[PDB]
Design an enzyme around this catalytic site. Structure first.
Site, short mmCIF file in Angstrom:
data_model
loop_
_atom_site.label_atom_id
_atom_site.label_comp_id
_atom_site.label_asym_id
_atom_site.label_seq_id
_atom_site.Cartn_x
_atom_site.Cartn_y
_atom_site.Cartn_z
N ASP A 187 0.84 -1.19 0.00
CA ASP A 187 0.00 0.00 0.00
C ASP A 187 0.88 1.24 0.00
O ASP A 187 1.68 1.43 0.92
CB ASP A 187 -0.92 0.04 1.21
CG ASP A 187 -1.85 1.24 1.15
OD1 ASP A 187 -2.81 1.20 0.36
OD2 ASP A 187 -1.56 2.25 1.85
N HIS B 240 -7.63 9.26 -2.61
CA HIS B 240 -7.07 9.11 -1.26
C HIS B 240 -8.03 9.62 -0.19
O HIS B 240 -8.21 8.99 0.86
CB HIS B 240 -5.71 9.83 -1.20
CG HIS B 240 -4.82 9.40 -0.09
ND1 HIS B 240 -3.45 9.50 -0.20
CD2 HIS B 240 -5.10 8.92 1.15
CE1 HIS B 240 -2.93 9.09 0.95
NE2 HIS B 240 -3.90 8.72 1.78
N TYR C 179 2.97 10.12 0.61
CA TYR C 179 3.90 9.55 1.58
C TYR C 179 5.35 9.89 1.26
O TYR C 179 6.22 9.71 2.11
CB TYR C 179 3.72 8.04 1.71
CG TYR C 179 2.34 7.58 2.14
CD1 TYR C 179 1.41 8.46 2.71
CD2 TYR C 179 1.94 6.26 1.97
CE1 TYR C 179 0.14 8.03 3.07
CE2 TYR C 179 0.68 5.82 2.31
CZ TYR C 179 -0.23 6.71 2.85
OH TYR C 179 -1.50 6.26 3.16
N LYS D 247 -2.54 5.97 -4.49
CA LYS D 247 -3.65 6.86 -4.19
C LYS D 247 -3.38 8.24 -4.79
O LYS D 247 -2.26 8.76 -4.70
CB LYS D 247 -3.90 6.99 -2.67
CG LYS D 247 -3.77 5.68 -1.92
CD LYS D 247 -4.20 5.78 -0.47
CE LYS D 247 -3.83 4.56 0.33
NZ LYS D 247 -2.38 4.52 0.69
N1 LIG Z 1 -5.97 5.72 3.13
C1 LIG Z 1 -5.56 6.49 4.14
O1 LIG Z 1 -6.00 7.63 4.34
C2 LIG Z 1 -4.54 5.93 5.08
C3 LIG Z 1 -4.36 6.50 6.33
C4 LIG Z 1 -3.52 5.89 7.26
C5 LIG Z 1 -2.85 4.74 6.91
N2 LIG Z 1 -2.99 4.24 5.66
C6 LIG Z 1 -2.18 3.02 5.24
O2 LIG Z 1 -2.28 2.05 6.26
C7 LIG Z 1 -0.95 1.69 6.70
C8 LIG Z 1 -0.97 1.21 8.13
O3 LIG Z 1 -1.40 2.27 9.02
P1 LIG Z 1 -0.38 3.12 9.90
O4 LIG Z 1 0.93 3.25 9.22
O5 LIG Z 1 -1.12 4.36 10.26
O6 LIG Z 1 -0.20 2.31 11.26
P2 LIG Z 1 -0.20 0.79 11.80
O7 LIG Z 1 0.07 -0.14 10.69
O8 LIG Z 1 -1.43 0.65 12.61
O9 LIG Z 1 1.00 0.88 12.84
C9 LIG Z 1 2.36 1.09 12.39
C10 LIG Z 1 3.22 1.20 13.62
O10 LIG Z 1 3.18 -0.06 14.33
C11 LIG Z 1 4.50 -0.53 14.54
N3 LIG Z 1 4.47 -1.99 14.44
C12 LIG Z 1 4.30 -2.72 13.30
N4 LIG Z 1 4.27 -4.02 13.50
C13 LIG Z 1 4.42 -4.14 14.87
C14 LIG Z 1 4.50 -5.27 15.70
N5 LIG Z 1 4.41 -6.53 15.26
N6 LIG Z 1 4.69 -5.05 17.02
C15 LIG Z 1 4.78 -3.79 17.47
N7 LIG Z 1 4.72 -2.65 16.77
C16 LIG Z 1 4.55 -2.90 15.46
C17 LIG Z 1 5.35 0.14 13.47
O11 LIG Z 1 6.71 0.24 13.92
P3 LIG Z 1 7.99 -0.01 12.95
O12 LIG Z 1 7.63 0.42 11.58
O13 LIG Z 1 9.06 0.83 13.61
O14 LIG Z 1 8.30 -1.49 13.05
C18 LIG Z 1 4.69 1.51 13.39
O15 LIG Z 1 5.11 2.34 14.46
C19 LIG Z 1 -0.15 2.96 6.41
O16 LIG Z 1 1.25 2.76 6.47
C20 LIG Z 1 -0.69 3.32 5.03
O17 LIG Z 1 -0.09 2.44 4.09
C21 LIG Z 1 -3.82 4.79 4.76
O1 LIG Z 2 -3.82 10.33 4.68
C1 LIG Z 2 -3.05 9.34 4.97
O2 LIG Z 2 -2.88 8.34 4.27
C2 LIG Z 2 -2.33 9.43 6.29
O3 LIG Z 2 -2.24 10.75 6.80
C3 LIG Z 2 -1.48 11.64 6.10
C4 LIG Z 2 -0.32 11.25 5.45
C5 LIG Z 2 0.45 12.24 4.89
F1 LIG Z 2 1.59 11.86 4.24
C6 LIG Z 2 0.13 13.57 4.94
C7 LIG Z 2 -1.04 13.94 5.58
C8 LIG Z 2 -1.87 12.98 6.16
C9 LIG Z 2 -3.17 13.47 6.72
O4 LIG Z 2 -3.25 14.56 7.29
N1 LIG Z 2 -4.24 12.69 6.53
C10 LIG Z 2 -5.56 13.06 7.01
C11 LIG Z 2 -6.41 13.83 6.02
C12 LIG Z 2 -5.90 14.24 4.79
C13 LIG Z 2 -6.70 14.91 3.88
C14 LIG Z 2 -8.03 15.18 4.17
C15 LIG Z 2 -8.51 14.76 5.39
N2 LIG Z 2 -9.93 14.98 5.71
O5 LIG Z 2 -10.34 14.60 6.80
O6 LIG Z 2 -10.64 15.51 4.86
C16 LIG Z 2 -7.73 14.10 6.32
#
Ligand SMILES: NC(=O)c1ccc[n+]([C@@H]2O[C@H](COP(=O)([O-])OP(=O)(O)OC[C@H]3O[C@@H](n4cnc5c(N)ncnc54)[C@H](OP(=O)(O)O)[C@@H]3O)[C@@H](O)[C@H]2O)c1
Ligand SMILES: O=C(O)COc1cc(F)ccc1C(=O)NCc1cccc([N+](=O)[O-])c1
Length: 313
Positions: free
Chosen positions: A44, A111, A49, A78
């Site tokens: 993803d 996104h 990012y 995205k």
């Molecule tokens: N569509 C959107 O708007 C949106 C928004 C947020 C996230 N996302 C996607 O979803 C992905 C996942 O969400 P996230 O990055 O917010 O957080 P997450 O996956 O919930 O948590 C990541 C964190 O957990 C730690 N971690 C990972 N595996 C672990 C384990 N087995 N034990 C302990 N700690 C562990 C990582 O540390 P280390 O990396 O240091 O190991 C990092 O600090 C994102 O990276 C992104 O690709 C999308």
């Molecule tokens: O959006 C993600 O995937 C995770 O959060 C971010 C990652 C980045 F690299 C930069 C910014 C964000 C962030 O602020 N993301 C949150 C966000 C963004 C845009 C619009 C909204 N909204 O509620 O309408 C919220």
């Protein structure tokens, strides 16, 4: 637990993927290489990012090494908010493709439903600190996404952070050509999303759960915030099953027919997080985890709350 879920475009999507938000550019190439080596087949990504070039280095190396074939990978990116205008979507997709070293994406998502003014800044601000919206709406942005399918740039299109009414707006779009394949939303035991998940699934839209571990590295974390990985109630379920808390948190969405995308740059955790296909949470475990809902969001978008399309009113 089969490894892939069938999408409404006829393609199969791996239910476990590697997240890359916050993965430092100097660490994410090795993270993705390790992930592919230990079995991940879904990554993803997102332009916002700022690390797609480095993700792409890993993908290209593993393809060159013939560790995997391209058709076995499922790469997601995205469209960022400053590219919602019709004339910017193709170029945004093509920049992501160039950076990722790919000829096509398996899935490309809007996104966020909120469009922002185009320009260099990812969050263009007025002098008073508000984000400057775009006047382009979700339906015209969707038509631009449909074009990408028809040009061969992407195999599937979808949405992210769309609320129930916004999903419905897409599904009811006059002249809709392709339904969204996926809605990627935040989901974990503190934000269980029963209503939005059932709606999407009932329409054949697959849901991907982001921040499944509660994003402990999110930049705006506060000490008073709840912590999934440290919750004694979740740790107890993990102990019963002889698994880690993270493994329980990853298996949970899988058993709800969701895709899940935990992020790590730590090799041992990347491998740990994939070892989730060999145990089952009971129905009682599942209902117990659901009971922890508190409507708590990692990504609350609190700086965007006046946007006509802010999703979380
Ligand atoms: N569509 C959107 O708007 C949106 C928004 C947020 C996230 N996302 C996607 O979803 C992905 C996942 O969400 P996230 O990055 O917010 O957080 P997450 O996956 O919930 O948590 C990541 C964190 O957990 C730690 N971690 C990972 N595996 C672990 C384990 N087995 N034990 C302990 N700690 C562990 C990582 O540390 P280390 O990396 O240091 O190991 C990092 O600090 C994102 O990276 C992104 O690709 C999308
Ligand atoms: O959006 C993600 O995937 C995770 O959060 C971010 C990652 C980045 F690299 C930069 C910014 C964000 C962030 O602020 N993301 C949150 C966000 C963004 C845009 C619009 C909204 N909204 O509620 O309408 C919220």
């Amino acid at each position: 637990m089969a490894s892939r879920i069938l999408l409404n475009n006829g393609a199969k999507m791996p239910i476990l993927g590697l997240g890359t938000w916050k993965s430092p550019p100097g660490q994410v190439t090795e993270a993705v290489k390790v992930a592919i080596d230990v079995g991940y087949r879904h990554i993803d990504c997102a332009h916002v990012y700022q690390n797609e070039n480095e993700v792409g280095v890993a993908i290209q190396e593993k393809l060159r090494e013939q560790v995997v074939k391209r058709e076995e990978l499922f790469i997601v990116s995205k469209l960022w908010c400053t590219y919602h205008e019709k004339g910017l979507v193709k170029g945004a997709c093509q920049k992501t493709l160039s950076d990722l070293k790919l000829d096509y994406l398996d899935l490309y998502l809007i996104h966020w439903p909120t469009g922002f003014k185009p320009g260099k800044e990812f969050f263009p601000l007025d002098e008073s600190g508000n984000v400057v919206p775009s006047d382009t709406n979700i339906l015209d942005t969707w038509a631009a996404m449909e074009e990408l399918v028809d040009e061969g740039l992407v195999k599937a299109i979808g949405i992210s952070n769309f609320n129930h009414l916004q999903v419905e707006m897409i599904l009811n779009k006059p002249g809709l050509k392709y339904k969204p394949a996926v809605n990627q939303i935040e989901c974990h035991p503190y934000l269980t999303q029963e209503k939005l998940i059932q709606y999407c699934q009932s329409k054949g839209i697959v849901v991907t759960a982001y921040s499944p571990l509660g994003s402990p590295d999110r930049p705006w974390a506060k000490p008073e915030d709840p912590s999934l990985l440290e919750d004694p109630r979740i740790k107890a379920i993990a102990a019963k099953h002889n698994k880690t808390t993270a493994q329980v948190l990853i298996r949970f969405p899988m058993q709800r027919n969701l895709v899940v995308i935990p992020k790590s740059v730590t090799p041992e955790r990347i491998a740990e997080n994939f070892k989730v296909f060999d145990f089952e949470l009971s129905s009682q475990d599942m209902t117990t985890l659901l009971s922890y809902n508190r409507n708590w969001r990692v990504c609350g978008g609190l700086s965007c709350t006046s946007h006509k399309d802010y999703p979380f009113h």
